[PDB]
Structure 1
């Protein structure tokens, strides 16, 4: 939960979008899948 909703930013200026109560980056990639 911390690393998912810990305000991730990329190397180049680019921040991802993350919804509320969402808990896994693997799960985000599985939604993309």
Structure 2
């Protein structure tokens, strides 16, 4: 289970850093619309669910 959760953390931090970099790199729309984003937010799913919860 050492190597198991070693591999689990080693893929989790990879996809996590990938998700956060994809969030706050640059989001222009199909047209010109730069997306407002937080200083230290992490997921498009996160900002999607919080814009759902502020319905």
- Asked if these proteins are the same fold (TM beyond 0.5), I'd say yes
Q: TM-score, normalised by structure 1?
A: 0.85
Tell me: higher relative CO, structure 1 or 2? Use CA pairs within 8 A at least 6 residues apart. 1
Q: How many residues align?
A: 33
Q: Is it true that 1:22 corresponds to 2:41 in the alignment?
A: yes
* Greater gyration radius: 2
Structure 2 runs not aligned, ≥5 long = 1-19
Structure with greater helix share of residues? 2
Q: TM-score, normalised by structure 2?
A: 0.56
Q: Give RMSD over aligned pairs.
A: 0.6
